[PDB]
UniProtKB/Swiss-Prot annotation, chains A, B:
Gene deletion effect: Mutants lacking this gene display a significant colonization defect in an infant mouse intestine colonization assay. Mutants show a decrease in vpsL expression and are deficient in biofilm formation. Deletion of the gene results in a 4.4-fold reduction in vxrA expression and a 134.8-fold reduction in survival following penicillin G treatment compared to those of the wild type.
Consequence when changing residue 104 to A: 1.7-fold decrease in vxrA expression. 11.9-fold reduction in survival following penicillin G treatment
Impact after mutating residue 213 to A: 2.1-fold decrease in vxrA expression and 11.7-fold reduction in survival following penicillin G treatment
Entry protein name: Sensor histidine kinase VxrA
Periplasmic side: 2-219
Description of its domains: Contains a unique periplasmic sensor domain (SD) and lacks a cytoplasmic linker domain between the second transmembrane helix and the dimerization and histidine phosphotransfer (DHp) domain, indicating that this system may utilize a potentially unique signal sensing and transmission mechanism. Detection of the signal via the periplasmic sensor region may induce conformational changes of the dimer and close the transmembrane helices TM1 and TM2 and subsequently the cytoplasmic DHp domains in a scissor-like mechanism, which changes the activation status of kinase domains.
Post-translational note: Autophosphorylated. Contains two disulfide bonds that may play a role in the stability of the protein. However, the disulfide bonds are not absolutely essential, as some activity and growth are detected in the absence of each disulfide bond.
Effect recorded for residue 205 to A: 2.1-fold decrease in vxrA expression and 11.7-fold reduction in survival following penicillin G treatment
UniProt subunit comment: Homodimer.
Gene name of the encoded protein: vxrA
Whole sequence portion shown: 37 to 255 of 499
C-alpha cells in the first residue's frame, strides 16, 4: 500500500477548502516584509562562517573602548563603519540600515544594537531587526507566526516547501500563496486520505530504528 | 555524508555507559510479568476483528439482562462462560483468568470487569488486567514506564526493536536487555556521533514534504 502514498498525499491536499483557511499569506508579501536574513536563525549567531573569530573579537574590543587595533578582513569595512559611528556618537539614519548588510558580525542586527543605544530610534529601525529581536507580535499576525517557527519550519518556508507544520498550524502552498489550517483540519483530512504523519525535528529522515528517524547533522 | 549514517549510529550506540543506565529490564522479565495482550492498545478496544459486532452486542445485552438470545460464534464459548458466571453469581477464581484468553470481546479484560463487580478480588486479579486498566504505577517502576508508552513505543518494545524513545527515556537494547537513558544523554551522544534525530509518531516515514514525514495508515 505504500506505493499509493503520492496519490494519497495528492488526495489529502485536495481535501482542503482554501477559501476557509485560518489565514493566508502571498509569498510576495512575506518577501516584501522580511528579508530572508531577518528570518533564518543563523543570523542571530556570531557570523563565524563569514569572519575569522579574531576579527569578531577585535571588533568587540574596539566597541567597548572606542580605541585599539582595527580588524583586517576586507569584509569588515561596514562593521567598522557601524562601530566607529557608535563610538563617535554620529547618527546612522534608517537609510543606513536599509542599504546595510543588516547582520552584525557578533550576531543579531546593526539596527537592534543601535536601538539599544538610542531607544528613541527603535520603531524606525524595527524593519531592519531580526524577527527574534522584535517584541512579541500580536497573535494572528504574520510576525507572530514567524516568531513562533522552529528552525525546521523557517527552512521549509524559506525553501518554498509545498507544506510544512509549525506550532498548531499546517501551512499549505498553492500557487505562490500559503494557506494556514489548524491541526484538527490537518488531522481530519489526513484521516480521510488514509494517511498518518510525523512532524520531523531534524532536516530529514534517512534511517529508522524503532520509532526514531536518524539524520546526519552535517549534510 | 548520509552514506556514513549506519556507522554513525553504531558509534552512537557505542557511546553509552551501559553500567550507568537509569535502569534496565531483561526482556525475559518483561515477558514474565506481561503478556503481550495486556500491553498492546488494541486489547483495550472492542474485538471487532475477532467477532462479528452482532455477537459483541448480543453478549452485552445478555450481560445487562441475564437473559435473551445467545451469541453464535464458536469463538464465543469462553465469553459466554464469563457472562453467565457473572449472571449466576458463581465464582471465577484467579485460576480461571490465568487459563483464559484474558481479553473480553467488548475490549479490556475479563479480570477488570470481574473486579468491578467484586472489588475485594481486585488485587488477586491485577496480573490479568491490561496495563491501561491498572492503577497509576509508582514512578520508576516497569509498569509506570509501560503505562506511559504510546502505541509506537509499545509496538517497538513488543517487536524487540534495537532502540526506541518513550517519554523522557531512550530505550537501548543490548543482548536481550533494554537499558534506559535519559533525554540529555541521548542528545549528548547523538551530538557526539554527528547525528540528528526525530521521534516518529506514525509507524514509519515514507515520503517527506517540508518537515512532515508521511505514512499510509494501513500497511
Amino acid at each position: 500500500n505504500a506505493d499509493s502514498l503520492p496519490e494519497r498525499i495528492d488526495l489529502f491536499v485536495s481535501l482542503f477548502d482554501y477559501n476557509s483557511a485560518t489565514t493566508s499569506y502571498d509569498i510576495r508579501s512575506i518577501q516584501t516584509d522580511f528579508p530572508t536574513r531577518l528570518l533564518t536563525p543563523d543570523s542571530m549567531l556570531p557570523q563565524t562562517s563569514e569572519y575569522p573569530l579574531k576579527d569578531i573579537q577585535l571588533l568587540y574590543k574596539l566597541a567597548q573602548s572606542c580605541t585599539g587595533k582595527l580588524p583586517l578582513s576586507p569584509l569588515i569595512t561596514e562593521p567598522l563603519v557601524f562601530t566607529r559611528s557608535l563610538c563617535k556618537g554620529s547618527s546612522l539614519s534608517p537609510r543606513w540600515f536599509a542599504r546595510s548588510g543588516l547582520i552584525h558580525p557578533g550576531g543579531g542586527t546593526y539596527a537592534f544594537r543601535y536601538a539599544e543605544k538610542y531607544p528613541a530610534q527603535f520603531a524606525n529601525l524595527l524593519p531592519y531587526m531580526h524577527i527574534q529581536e522584535r517584541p512579541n507580535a500580536a497573535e494572528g499576525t504574520l510576525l507572530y507566526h514567524l516568531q513562533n517557527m522552529g528552525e525546521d519550519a523557517i527552512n521549509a518556508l524559506v525553501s518554498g516547501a509545498s507544506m510544512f507544520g509549525s506550532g498548531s498550524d499546517l501551512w499549505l502552498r498553492k500557487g505562490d500563496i500559503y494557506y494556514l489550517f489548524n491541526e484538527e483540519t490537518w488531522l481530519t483530512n489526513a484521516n480521510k486520505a488514509g494517511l498518518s504523519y510525523s512532524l520531523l525535528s531534524a532536516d530529514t529522515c534517512f534511517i529508522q530504528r524503532g520509532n526514531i528517524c536518524w539524520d546526519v547533522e552535517d549534510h
